[PDB]
PDB file of N, CA and C in Angstrom:
ATOM      1  N   UNK A 248      -7.323  16.681   0.523  1.00 47.74           N
ATOM      2  CA  UNK A 248      -7.500  16.145   1.891  1.00 47.74           C
ATOM      3  C   UNK A 248      -8.800  15.358   1.992  1.00 47.74           C
ATOM      4  N   UNK A 249      -8.746  14.231   2.681  1.00 47.94           N
ATOM      5  CA  UNK A 249      -9.911  13.380   2.859  1.00 47.94           C
ATOM      6  C   UNK A 249     -10.435  13.516   4.282  1.00 47.94           C
ATOM      7  N   UNK A 250     -11.716  13.820   4.417  1.00 48.10           N
ATOM      8  CA  UNK A 250     -12.324  13.979   5.725  1.00 48.10           C
ATOM      9  C   UNK A 250     -13.081  12.714   6.122  1.00 48.10           C
ATOM     10  N   UNK A 251     -12.433  11.876   6.918  1.00 46.98           N
ATOM     11  CA  UNK A 251     -13.034  10.629   7.371  1.00 46.98           C
ATOM     12  C   UNK A 251     -13.892  10.873   8.605  1.00 46.98           C
ATOM     13  N   UNK A 252     -14.990  10.139   8.713  1.00 44.19           N
ATOM     14  CA  UNK A 252     -15.885  10.276   9.849  1.00 44.19           C
ATOM     15  C   UNK A 252     -15.683   9.135  10.835  1.00 44.19           C
ATOM     16  N   UNK A 253     -15.079   9.453  11.967  1.00 44.48           N
ATOM     17  CA  UNK A 253     -14.844   8.466  13.006  1.00 44.48           C
ATOM     18  C   UNK A 253     -16.022   8.465  13.965  1.00 44.48           C
ATOM     19  N   UNK A 254     -16.661   7.319  14.121  1.00 43.74           N
ATOM     20  CA  UNK A 254     -17.815   7.215  15.000  1.00 43.74           C
ATOM     21  C   UNK A 254     -17.397   6.817  16.410  1.00 43.74           C
ATOM     22  N   UNK A 255     -17.492   7.769  17.331  1.00 43.93           N
ATOM     23  CA  UNK A 255     -17.144   7.509  18.711  1.00 43.93           C
ATOM     24  C   UNK A 255     -18.221   6.710  19.422  1.00 43.93           C
ATOM     25  N   UNK A 256     -17.842   6.039  20.504  1.00 43.19           N
ATOM     26  CA  UNK A 256     -18.775   5.212  21.268  1.00 43.19           C
ATOM     27  C   UNK A 256     -19.893   6.052  21.889  1.00 43.19           C
ATOM     28  N   UNK A 257     -19.644   7.347  22.057  1.00 46.10           N
ATOM     29  CA  UNK A 257     -20.633   8.249  22.645  1.00 46.10           C
ATOM     30  C   UNK A 257     -21.311   9.108  21.576  1.00 46.10           C
ATOM     31  N   UNK A 258     -21.391   8.563  20.361  1.00 45.04           N
ATOM     32  CA  UNK A 258     -22.040   9.231  19.226  1.00 45.04           C
ATOM     33  C   UNK A 258     -21.296  10.500  18.799  1.00 45.04           C
ATOM     34  N   UNK A 259     -19.997  10.538  19.042  1.00 45.27           N
ATOM     35  CA  UNK A 259     -19.178  11.681  18.664  1.00 45.27           C
ATOM     36  C   UNK A 259     -18.649  11.484  17.248  1.00 45.27           C
ATOM     37  N   UNK A 260     -18.891  12.453  16.385  1.00 46.79           N
ATOM     38  CA  UNK A 260     -18.443  12.359  15.006  1.00 46.79           C
ATOM     39  C   UNK A 260     -17.131  13.111  14.814  1.00 46.79           C
ATOM     40  N   UNK A 261     -16.040  12.366  14.749  1.00 48.68           N
ATOM     41  CA  UNK A 261     -14.723  12.963  14.585  1.00 48.68           C
ATOM     42  C   UNK A 261     -14.383  13.108  13.107  1.00 48.68           C
ATOM     43  N   UNK A 262     -13.958  14.299  12.719  1.00 45.95           N
ATOM     44  CA  UNK A 262     -13.600  14.578  11.337  1.00 45.95           C
ATOM     45  C   UNK A 262     -12.083  14.613  11.202  1.00 45.95           C
ATOM     46  N   UNK A 263     -11.503  13.489  10.820  1.00 47.63           N
ATOM     47  CA  UNK A 263     -10.063  13.408  10.664  1.00 47.63           C
ATOM     48  C   UNK A 263      -9.665  13.750   9.238  1.00 47.63           C
ATOM     49  N   UNK A 264      -8.924  14.837   9.092  1.00 48.74           N
ATOM     50  CA  UNK A 264      -8.469  15.282   7.787  1.00 48.74           C
ATOM     51  C   UNK A 264      -7.163  14.590   7.422  1.00 48.74           C
ATOM     52  N   UNK A 265      -7.271  13.557   6.603  1.00 49.01           N
ATOM     53  CA  UNK A 265      -6.114  12.787   6.180  1.00 49.01           C
ATOM     54  C   UNK A 265      -5.722  13.136   4.748  1.00 49.01           C
ATOM     55  N   UNK A 266      -4.582  12.631   4.311  1.00 46.77           N
ATOM     56  CA  UNK A 266      -4.100  12.889   2.964  1.00 46.77           C
ATOM     57  C   UNK A 266      -3.777  11.573   2.271  1.00 46.77           C
ATOM     58  N   UNK A 267      -4.113  11.475   0.990  1.00 44.66           N
ATOM     59  CA  UNK A 267      -3.856  10.262   0.218  1.00 44.66           C
ATOM     60  C   UNK A 267      -2.377  10.158  -0.142  1.00 44.66           C
ATOM     61  N   UNK A 268      -1.546  10.037   0.880  1.00 44.04           N
ATOM     62  CA  UNK A 268      -0.104   9.928   0.710  1.00 44.04           C
ATOM     63  C   UNK A 268       0.518   9.352   1.973  1.00 44.04           C
ATOM     64  N   UNK A 269       0.009   9.799   3.108  1.00 44.02           N
ATOM     65  CA  UNK A 269       0.503   9.368   4.400  1.00 44.02           C
ATOM     66  C   UNK A 269       0.018   7.965   4.759  1.00 44.02           C
ATOM     67  N   UNK A 270       0.683   7.372   5.732  1.00 45.87           N
ATOM     68  CA  UNK A 270       0.352   6.041   6.214  1.00 45.87           C
ATOM     69  C   UNK A 270      -0.654   6.140   7.353  1.00 45.87           C
ATOM     70  N   UNK A 271      -1.450   5.095   7.543  1.00 45.32           N
ATOM     71  CA  UNK A 271      -2.452   5.093   8.600  1.00 45.32           C
ATOM     72  C   UNK A 271      -1.803   4.947   9.974  1.00 45.32           C
ATOM     73  N   UNK A 272      -0.512   4.631   9.988  1.00 46.10           N
ATOM     74  CA  UNK A 272       0.237   4.504  11.231  1.00 46.10           C
ATOM     75  C   UNK A 272       0.208   5.836  11.976  1.00 46.10           C
ATOM     76  N   UNK A 273       0.485   6.904  11.233  1.00 48.14           N
ATOM     77  CA  UNK A 273       0.488   8.254  11.779  1.00 48.14           C
ATOM     78  C   UNK A 273      -0.905   8.633  12.277  1.00 48.14           C
ATOM     79  N   UNK A 274      -1.923   8.190  11.553  1.00 48.08           N
ATOM     80  CA  UNK A 274      -3.305   8.487  11.910  1.00 48.08           C
ATOM     81  C   UNK A 274      -3.716   7.760  13.187  1.00 48.08           C
ATOM     82  N   UNK A 275      -3.371   6.482  13.270  1.00 48.54           N
ATOM     83  CA  UNK A 275      -3.718   5.662  14.427  1.00 48.54           C
ATOM     84  C   UNK A 275      -3.123   6.215  15.722  1.00 48.54           C
ATOM     85  N   UNK A 276      -1.840   6.562  15.695  1.00 48.13           N
ATOM     86  CA  UNK A 276      -1.174   7.077  16.889  1.00 48.13           C
ATOM     87  C   UNK A 276      -1.688   8.467  17.264  1.00 48.13           C
ATOM     88  N   UNK A 277      -1.966   9.303  16.269  1.00 44.44           N
ATOM     89  CA  UNK A 277      -2.455  10.656  16.529  1.00 44.44           C
ATOM     90  C   UNK A 277      -3.841  10.633  17.168  1.00 44.44           C
ATOM     91  N   UNK A 278      -4.669   9.677  16.764  1.00 44.29           N
ATOM     92  CA  UNK A 278      -6.007   9.559  17.319  1.00 44.29           C
ATOM     93  C   UNK A 278      -5.932   9.173  18.791  1.00 44.29           C
ATOM     94  N   UNK A 279      -4.946   8.347  19.130  1.00 40.97           N
ATOM     95  CA  UNK A 279      -4.756   7.916  20.507  1.00 40.97           C
ATOM     96  C   UNK A 279      -4.413   9.119  21.388  1.00 40.97           C
ATOM     97  N   UNK A 280      -3.667  10.061  20.817  1.00 44.42           N
ATOM     98  CA  UNK A 280      -3.274  11.269  21.530  1.00 44.42           C
ATOM     99  C   UNK A 280      -4.481  12.179  21.727  1.00 44.42           C
ATOM    100  N   UNK A 281      -5.385  12.162  20.751  1.00 42.37           N
ATOM    101  CA  UNK A 281      -6.592  12.980  20.801  1.00 42.37           C
ATOM    102  C   UNK A 281      -7.476  12.562  21.973  1.00 42.37           C
ATOM    103  N   UNK A 282      -7.456  11.273  22.295  1.00 41.96           N
ATOM    104  CA  UNK A 282      -8.267  10.750  23.389  1.00 41.96           C
ATOM    105  C   UNK A 282      -7.487  10.745  24.703  1.00 41.96           C
ATOM    106  N   UNK A 283      -6.170  10.604  24.611  1.00 41.96           N
ATOM    107  CA  UNK A 283      -5.339  10.593  25.803  1.00 41.96           C
ATOM    108  C   UNK A 283      -5.009   9.186  26.266  1.00 41.96           C
ATOM    109  N   UNK A 284      -4.877   8.276  25.313  1.00 40.39           N
ATOM    110  CA  UNK A 284      -4.565   6.887  25.613  1.00 40.39           C
ATOM    111  C   UNK A 284      -3.371   6.423  24.786  1.00 40.39           C
ATOM    112  N   UNK A 285      -2.656   5.380  25.240  1.00 37.79           N
ATOM    113  CA  UNK A 285      -1.506   4.846  24.508  1.00 37.79           C
ATOM    114  C   UNK A 285      -1.942   4.165  23.217  1.00 37.79           C
ATOM    115  N   UNK A 286      -1.044   4.066  22.252  1.00 36.98           N
ATOM    116  CA  UNK A 286      -1.374   3.431  20.982  1.00 36.98           C
ATOM    117  C   UNK A 286      -1.625   1.937  21.183  1.00 36.98           C
ATOM    118  N   UNK A 287      -2.388   1.343  20.257  1.00 36.09           N
ATOM    119  CA  UNK A 287      -2.723  -0.091  20.277  1.00 36.09           C
ATOM    120  C   UNK A 287      -3.859  -0.394  21.258  1.00 36.09           C
ATOM    121  N   UNK A 288      -4.360   0.634  21.931  1.00 37.93           N
ATOM    122  CA  UNK A 288      -5.455   0.455  22.878  1.00 37.93           C
ATOM    123  C   UNK A 288      -6.791   0.518  22.149  1.00 37.93           C
ATOM    124  N   UNK A 289      -6.811   1.247  21.040  1.00 34.31           N
ATOM    125  CA  UNK A 289      -8.015   1.408  20.249  1.00 34.31           C
ATOM    126  C   UNK A 289      -7.871   0.715  18.901  1.00 34.31           C
ATOM    127  N   UNK A 290      -8.858  -0.095  18.556  1.00 32.51           N
ATOM    128  CA  UNK A 290      -8.856  -0.805  17.292  1.00 32.51           C
ATOM    129  C   UNK A 290      -9.765  -0.095  16.301  1.00 32.51           C
ATOM    130  N   UNK A 291      -9.245   0.154  15.118  1.00 31.62           N
ATOM    131  CA  UNK A 291     -10.011   0.813  14.077  1.00 31.62           C
ATOM    132  C   UNK A 291     -10.597  -0.232  13.148  1.00 31.62           C
ATOM    133  N   UNK A 292     -11.914  -0.284  13.088  1.00 30.53           N
ATOM    134  CA  UNK A 292     -12.593  -1.255  12.254  1.00 30.53           C
ATOM    135  C   UNK A 292     -13.133  -0.609  10.991  1.00 30.53           C
ATOM    136  N   UNK A 293     -12.733  -1.164   9.861  1.00 29.68           N
ATOM    137  CA  UNK A 293     -13.166  -0.684   8.567  1.00 29.68           C
ATOM    138  C   UNK A 293     -13.726  -1.847   7.763  1.00 29.68           C
ATOM    139  N   UNK A 294     -15.048  -1.886   7.642  1.00 31.07           N
ATOM    140  CA  UNK A 294     -15.744  -2.937   6.903  1.00 31.07           C
ATOM    141  C   UNK A 294     -15.572  -4.298   7.573  1.00 31.07           C
ATOM    142  N   UNK A 295     -15.323  -4.280   8.876  1.00 29.26           N
ATOM    143  CA  UNK A 295     -15.153  -5.512   9.619  1.00 29.26           C
ATOM    144  C   UNK A 295     -13.700  -5.895   9.803  1.00 29.26           C
ATOM    145  N   UNK A 296     -12.810  -5.220   9.091  1.00 29.03           N
ATOM    146  CA  UNK A 296     -11.387  -5.509   9.193  1.00 29.03           C
ATOM    147  C   UNK A 296     -10.701  -4.477  10.073  1.00 29.03           C
ATOM    148  N   UNK A 297      -9.656  -4.894  10.771  1.00 27.04           N
ATOM    149  CA  UNK A 297      -8.925  -3.990  11.645  1.00 27.04           C
ATOM    150  C   UNK A 297      -7.806  -3.297  10.876  1.00 27.04           C
ATOM    151  N   UNK A 298      -7.737  -1.983  11.022  1.00 26.40           N
ATOM    152  CA  UNK A 298      -6.726  -1.181  10.350  1.00 26.40           C
ATOM    153  C   UNK A 298      -5.338  -1.440  10.931  1.00 26.40           C
ATOM    154  N   UNK A 299      -4.433  -1.886  10.076  1.00 25.99           N
ATOM    155  CA  UNK A 299      -3.067  -2.174  10.477  1.00 25.99           C
ATOM    156  C   UNK A 299      -2.224  -0.907  10.432  1.00 25.99           C
ATOM    157  N   UNK A 300      -1.023  -0.980  10.981  1.00 25.11           N
ATOM    158  CA  UNK A 300      -0.124   0.169  11.014  1.00 25.11           C
ATOM    159  C   UNK A 300       0.447   0.463   9.633  1.00 25.11           C
ATOM    160  N   UNK A 301       0.611  -0.577   8.828  1.00 23.06           N
ATOM    161  CA  UNK A 301       1.160  -0.427   7.485  1.00 23.06           C
ATOM    162  C   UNK A 301       0.053  -0.209   6.460  1.00 23.06           C
ATOM    163  N   UNK A 302      -1.162   0.001   6.943  1.00 24.73           N
ATOM    164  CA  UNK A 302      -2.302   0.218   6.066  1.00 24.73           C
ATOM    165  C   UNK A 302      -2.263   1.617   5.464  1.00 24.73           C
ATOM    166  N   UNK A 303      -2.787   1.742   4.259  1.00 23.75           N
ATOM    167  CA  UNK A 303      -2.826   3.023   3.578  1.00 23.75           C
ATOM    168  C   UNK A 303      -4.211   3.257   2.981  1.00 23.75           C
ATOM    169  N   UNK A 304      -4.687   4.515   2.956  1.00 23.52           N
ATOM    170  CA  UNK A 304      -6.013   4.859   2.404  1.00 23.52           C
ATOM    171  C   UNK A 304      -6.169   4.465   0.933  1.00 23.52           C
ATOM    172  N   UNK A 305      -5.052   4.140   0.289  1.00 25.20           N
ATOM    173  CA  UNK A 305      -5.060   3.741  -1.111  1.00 25.20           C
ATOM    174  C   UNK A 305      -5.628   2.329  -1.264  1.00 25.20           C
ATOM    175  N   UNK A 306      -5.487   1.515  -0.230  1.00 24.17           N
ATOM    176  CA  UNK A 306      -6.001   0.156  -0.271  1.00 24.17           C
ATOM    177  C   UNK A 306      -7.346   0.095   0.439  1.00 24.17           C
ATOM    178  N   UNK A 307      -8.014  -1.057   0.346  1.00 22.67           N
ATOM    179  CA  UNK A 307      -9.329  -1.276   0.965  1.00 22.67           C
ATOM    180  C   UNK A 307     -10.420  -0.508   0.218  1.00 22.67           C
ATOM    181  N   UNK A 308     -10.239   0.795   0.091  1.00 24.90           N
ATOM    182  CA  UNK A 308     -11.204   1.619  -0.605  1.00 24.90           C
ATOM    183  C   UNK A 308     -11.764   2.712   0.271  1.00 24.90           C
ATOM    184  N   UNK A 309     -10.912   3.652   0.652  1.00 24.24           N
ATOM    185  CA  UNK A 309     -11.329   4.761   1.498  1.00 24.24           C
ATOM    186  C   UNK A 309     -11.646   5.986   0.653  1.00 24.24           C
ATOM    187  N   UNK A 310     -12.730   6.666   0.988  1.00 26.11           N
ATOM    188  CA  UNK A 310     -13.142   7.857   0.257  1.00 26.11           C
ATOM    189  C   UNK A 310     -13.613   8.956   1.206  1.00 26.11           C
ATOM    190  N   UNK A 311     -14.143  10.029   0.636  1.00 26.75           N
ATOM    191  CA  UNK A 311     -14.640  11.151   1.415  1.00 26.75           C
ATOM    192  C   UNK A 311     -15.957  10.776   2.087  1.00 26.75           C
ATOM    193  N   UNK A 312     -16.128  11.222   3.335  1.00 26.84           N
ATOM    194  CA  UNK A 312     -17.332  10.941   4.122  1.00 26.84           C
ATOM    195  C   UNK A 312     -17.408   9.460   4.478  1.00 26.84           C
ATOM    196  N   UNK A 313     -16.256   8.797   4.487  1.00 27.02           N
ATOM    197  CA  UNK A 313     -16.197   7.382   4.825  1.00 27.02           C
ATOM    198  C   UNK A 313     -16.435   7.192   6.313  1.00 27.02           C
ATOM    199  N   UNK A 314     -16.958   6.035   6.678  1.00 28.82           N
ATOM    200  CA  UNK A 314     -17.259   5.740   8.070  1.00 28.82           C
ATOM    201  C   UNK A 314     -16.271   4.736   8.654  1.00 28.82           C
ATOM    202  N   UNK A 315     -15.607   5.132   9.726  1.00 28.03           N
ATOM    203  CA  UNK A 315     -14.652   4.267  10.398  1.00 28.03           C
ATOM    204  C   UNK A 315     -15.013   4.171  11.878  1.00 28.03           C
ATOM    205  N   UNK A 316     -15.000   2.960  12.415  1.00 27.77           N
ATOM    206  CA  UNK A 316     -15.357   2.753  13.812  1.00 27.77           C
ATOM    207  C   UNK A 316     -14.122   2.528  14.671  1.00 27.77           C
ATOM    208  N   UNK A 317     -14.178   3.005  15.905  1.00 25.54           N
ATOM    209  CA  UNK A 317     -13.073   2.850  16.837  1.00 25.54           C
ATOM    210  C   UNK A 317     -13.568   2.224  18.142  1.00 25.54           C
ATOM    211  N   UNK A 318     -12.942   1.126  18.537  1.00 24.94           N
ATOM    212  CA  UNK A 318     -13.326   0.431  19.761  1.00 24.94           C
ATOM    213  C   UNK A 318     -12.107   0.157  20.625  1.00 24.94           C
ATOM    214  N   UNK A 319     -12.327  -0.030  21.913  1.00 21.55           N
ATOM    215  CA  UNK A 319     -11.237  -0.313  22.829  1.00 21.55           C
ATOM    216  C   UNK A 319     -10.898  -1.800  22.796  1.00 21.55           C
ATOM    217  N   UNK A 320      -9.617  -2.109  22.671  1.00 20.93           N
ATOM    218  CA  UNK A 320      -9.159  -3.490  22.630  1.00 20.93           C
ATOM    219  C   UNK A 320      -9.112  -4.082  24.030  1.00 20.93           C
ATOM    220  N   UNK A 321      -9.229  -5.399  24.110  1.00 22.05           N
ATOM    221  CA  UNK A 321      -9.207  -6.097  25.390  1.00 22.05           C
ATOM    222  C   UNK A 321      -7.810  -6.068  26.004  1.00 22.05           C
ATOM    223  N   UNK A 322      -6.820  -5.718  25.192  1.00 23.74           N
ATOM    224  CA  UNK A 322      -5.443  -5.641  25.653  1.00 23.74           C
ATOM    225  C   UNK A 322      -5.230  -4.403  26.514  1.00 23.74           C
ATOM    226  N   UNK A 323      -6.061  -3.387  26.288  1.00 24.70           N
ATOM    227  CA  UNK A 323      -5.952  -2.145  27.032  1.00 24.70           C
ATOM    228  C   UNK A 323      -4.850  -1.252  26.494  1.00 24.70           C
ATOM    229  N   UNK A 324      -4.051  -1.803  25.594  1.00 23.61           N
ATOM    230  CA  UNK A 324      -2.952  -1.074  25.009  1.00 23.61           C
ATOM    231  C   UNK A 324      -2.051  -1.994  24.225  1.00 23.61           C
TER     232      UNK A 324
ATOM    233  N   UNK B 234     -24.428  15.087  16.219  1.00 24.41           N
ATOM    234  CA  UNK B 234     -24.359  16.528  15.878  1.00 24.41           C
ATOM    235  C   UNK B 234     -23.100  17.161  16.467  1.00 24.41           C
ATOM    236  N   UNK B 235     -22.072  16.352  16.700  1.00 20.54           N
ATOM    237  CA  UNK B 235     -20.822  16.871  17.243  1.00 20.54           C
ATOM    238  C   UNK B 235     -19.714  16.629  16.246  1.00 20.54           C
ATOM    239  N   UNK B 236     -19.020  17.688  15.864  1.00 22.47           N
ATOM    240  CA  UNK B 236     -17.930  17.564  14.910  1.00 22.47           C
ATOM    241  C   UNK B 236     -16.622  18.100  15.482  1.00 22.47           C
ATOM    242  N   UNK B 237     -15.591  17.279  15.404  1.00 22.16           N
ATOM    243  CA  UNK B 237     -14.258  17.653  15.866  1.00 22.16           C
ATOM    244  C   UNK B 237     -13.290  17.522  14.697  1.00 22.16           C
ATOM    245  N   UNK B 238     -12.460  18.544  14.407  1.00 24.68           N
ATOM    246  CA  UNK B 238     -11.536  18.471  13.294  1.00 24.68           C
ATOM    247  C   UNK B 238     -10.076  18.341  13.710  1.00 24.68           C
ATOM    248  N   UNK B 239      -9.445  17.325  13.140  1.00 26.43           N
ATOM    249  CA  UNK B 239      -8.047  17.008  13.387  1.00 26.43           C
ATOM    250  C   UNK B 239      -7.280  17.081  12.080  1.00 26.43           C
ATOM    251  N   UNK B 240      -6.107  17.675  12.116  1.00 25.60           N
ATOM    252  CA  UNK B 240      -5.298  17.826  10.928  1.00 25.60           C
ATOM    253  C   UNK B 240      -4.027  17.001  11.061  1.00 25.60           C
ATOM    254  N   UNK B 241      -3.711  16.319   9.982  1.00 26.09           N
ATOM    255  CA  UNK B 241      -2.579  15.417   9.909  1.00 26.09           C
ATOM    256  C   UNK B 241      -1.518  15.938   8.953  1.00 26.09           C
ATOM    257  N   UNK B 242      -0.277  15.676   9.313  1.00 22.53           N
ATOM    258  CA  UNK B 242       0.871  16.121   8.557  1.00 22.53           C
ATOM    259  C   UNK B 242       1.427  14.936   7.792  1.00 22.53           C
ATOM    260  N   UNK B 243       1.759  15.190   6.540  1.00 23.01           N
ATOM    261  CA  UNK B 243       2.200  14.154   5.637  1.00 23.01           C
ATOM    262  C   UNK B 243       3.676  14.297   5.315  1.00 23.01           C
ATOM    263  N   UNK B 244       4.367  13.181   5.484  1.00 22.10           N
ATOM    264  CA  UNK B 244       5.793  13.087   5.267  1.00 22.10           C
ATOM    265  C   UNK B 244       6.131  12.970   3.785  1.00 22.10           C
ATOM    266  N   UNK B 245       6.853  13.965   3.251  1.00 21.35           N
ATOM    267  CA  UNK B 245       7.268  13.989   1.849  1.00 21.35           C
ATOM    268  C   UNK B 245       8.416  13.019   1.576  1.00 21.35           C
TER     269      UNK B 245
END
C-alpha cells in the first residue's frame, strides 16, 4: 500500500492509502466523498499536471510519502 | 500536524 500525502488548502495532511493496481479514478471520486463535494470539482495537481481519471500510480512516478495538491476547479463540479 | 487516513479498495 502506498501512503500519499494530500495537502489540503487549510494545511491538512491527508494520508490516502492507495494500491499499485487500482486506477486513480476510484481515488479521485472517493476523495470528493471525503470532503462532501461532487466529482470533478477538485483538481489534483501532480508536478504541475492534472490527474486524469484514466491515470494510474504506475505512470508519472508516484511513490511513498509523495506530495499531491488538491484545488477547487472554476467549474465548481 | 493533522493526519487523516483513508483506505481504498482495489478491483481484482
